[PDB]
Amino acid sequence: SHMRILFLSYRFNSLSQRLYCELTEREHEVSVELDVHPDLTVEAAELYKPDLIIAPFLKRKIPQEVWKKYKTLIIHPGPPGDRGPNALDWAIMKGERIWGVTLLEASEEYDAGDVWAYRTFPMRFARKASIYRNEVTEGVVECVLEALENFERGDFKPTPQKEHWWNPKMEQELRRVDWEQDDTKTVLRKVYASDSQPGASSKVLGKEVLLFNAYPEEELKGKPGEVLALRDEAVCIGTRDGAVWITHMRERKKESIKLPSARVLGEFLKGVKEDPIKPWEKVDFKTYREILYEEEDGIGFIHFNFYNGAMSTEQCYRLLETIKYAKKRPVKAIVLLGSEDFFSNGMNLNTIENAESPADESWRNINAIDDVCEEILKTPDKLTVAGMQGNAGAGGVFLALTCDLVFAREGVVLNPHYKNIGNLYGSEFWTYTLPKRVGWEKGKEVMENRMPISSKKAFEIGLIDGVFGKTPKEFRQRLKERIKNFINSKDFYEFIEKKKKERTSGEWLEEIQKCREHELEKMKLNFYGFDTSYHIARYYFVRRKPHFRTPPYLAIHRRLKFSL
Ligand SMILES: CC(C)(COP(=O)(O)OP(=O)(O)OC[C@H]1O[C@@H](n2cnc3c(N)ncnc32)[C@H](O)[C@@H]1OP(=O)(O)O)[C@@H](O)C(=O)NCCC(=O)NCCS
Ligand SMILES: Nc1nc2c(c(=O)[nH]1)N[C@@H](CNc1ccc(C(=O)N[C@@H](CCC(=O)O)C(=O)O)cc1)CN2
């Protein structure tokens, strides 16, 4: 089995990238045609002539010319019989206790085809994006692998649907948060169902907005719709029975972008008081904690729940503060855990795009990230560990590589390159860390590859030190146990004595400083040089500008010397 597989995807999104990894790392070939026009889709099928078509993420109908000619399998993020374009939204709004995913054949009627495979799972009360990125994506991977085995077997017959139902596109009126009528549980459900798109509409301080990234608040109380506090740019708003934090909003205008709530509401918030909670404090009630520091068994764990993995200048400085605190604690190891869904996606391109000078903000942001990285590297007397529970891209990957040890959950997808953001040179001391791990030649290959790689592939090529665990929680438990065993071994004290000698030597310190200087001179050129590739790419990314063709790096069937 060395199949030629065509993906049809509206966007080469997290699910499409995970499946690309699983299939190519099994030596199948995967070409991608983006969903631009049915005529383009027909052309791509005739050009590539796939053994099999998989549609991981598709907003419109595959033309009959295609799927009547090539076996076409379609991902649906609901259990068998569920039909419609907003399966997860409805599941969350209705409070389903069980959900699932289905791999079904293309047919004329939407989501009506025979079932090739499916998986079910218990629902979490959580954002739609988190369910999509965890339960749904893991379940779809098992379905596609099972279908591949069925396909190459040759005698598989799919199971036609029996019971079924249709849920239409969900209207905003259903998502709209009414602070006076909605208790906290209802506000969470609506925001969760609409996160990360299209957001739950609401009015806040008289502004029509879309709400994102909600968290319950049990201590602060007030009037429904009253802003009770600010905390790391999230706002806390009274509900019918309590209060909810909203960390991000978007104004309901065509060109607006998702930003920290404080930046969207602006002067409307004048007078609200910051209610700070340091990451290392203990509290007994539910509240919003962007960064959390906890110590167990001689290990200091730093969770940083930065929305979408995007690290603003100010979030970097808050993370830096917590790393400095941890370096002063009696721990043997410091573990950077990111969040369950992302380790890090590097600089925050939205707060950059929103600044008066995106170039100056990029410069602020890359220096802030490098300060975090430098603080990590210059930790002579403690083990540092990156635990990648979730995906990482661009600078977020190289952030992890500054730690002594990098581990990742099974199924994490890595994008250790800058080809989507205008071929940035990158920093985070990659010119020091990457050759140490894989050599200069391989490291340059890694950064020239625009396609994703899995954590398994990253481990096999030496980019990271291990991969284990299927869920974030299992990964965290295995990580703690692995680090605990190490710091309680004789090997740890020998390693630390060596690291003390290396990381306090003038030779080492001057080397890493030169690496930062060289990287930042190159990023300066990216940010400020006459060539504005970086700013153009950031604009397309942040504004989600459509494609009018599939680039040849995705479409094998559209490269220059493509034959047969
Ligand atoms: C890493 C990457 C390839 C992953 O692709 P993917 O799995 O399809 O994930 P998405 O692009 O859909 O990201 C999910 C969300 O996080 C956003 N996001 C990801 N990285 C971001 C970043 N650095 N800054 C701001 N937003 C980011 C995306 O806009 C998207 O937003 P939305 O769901 O609110 O609509 C892609 O997210 C990416 O290129 N991010 C930018 C990394 C970067 O260039 N950082 C700056 C240089 S250090
Ligand atoms: N051949 C064929 N093509 C398909 C599917 C199929 O089974 N058969 N299933 C699709 C995946 N699931 C859906 C289900 C419903 C809708 C849908 O309802 N679209 C509305 C617009 C809704 C929107 O705004 O997104 C329309 O009028 O086209 C879109 C994708 C992929 N395209």
Numbering used by the authors: -1 to 562
What does the study report here?
The crystallographic analyses reveal that HypX consists of the N- and C-terminal domains that are structurally homologous to the hydrolase domain of FDH and enoyl-CoA hydratase/isomerase (ECH/ECI), respectively. HypX will catalyze two consecutive reactions, the formyl-group transfer from N10-formyl-THF to CoA and decarbonylation of formyl-CoA, in the N- and C-terminal domains, respectively, to produce CO. The putative catalytic residues, His74, Asp80, and Asp109 in the N-terminal domain and Ty416 and Glu426 in the C-terminal domain, are perfectly conserved among HypX homologs listed in the previous report. CoA is constitutively bound in HypX, which will act as the prosthetic group for CO biosynthesis through the formation and the decarbonylation of formyl-CoA. CO produced by HypX is used as a ligand of the iron in the NiFe(CN)2(CO) center of NiFe hydrogenases.
The space group (C2221) and the cell dimensions of the crystal were not changed significantly by soaking with THF. THF is bound at the N-terminal region inside the cavity that is present through the N- and C-terminal domains. There is little structural change in a whole protein upon THF binding. However, slight conformational changes were observed for side chains of Leu56, Lys59, and Tyr108. THF binding caused relocation of Leu56 and Tyr108 residues because steric hindrance may occur with THF at the original positions of these residues in THF-free HypX upon THF binding. Lys59 residue shifted toward the domains interface because relocation of Tyr108 caused steric hindrance between Tyr108 and Lys59. The β3-α3 loop in which Leu56 and Lys59 are located also shifted slightly upon THF binding. Because the N10 of THF forms a hydrogen bond with Asp109, the formyl group of N10-formyl-THF will lead steric hindrance with Asp109 in the present structure of THF-bound HypX. Comparing the structures between THF-free and THF-bound HypX indicates that conformational changes around the THF binding region are induced by THF binding as shown in Supplementary Fig. 5, which is an induced fit type of conformational change.
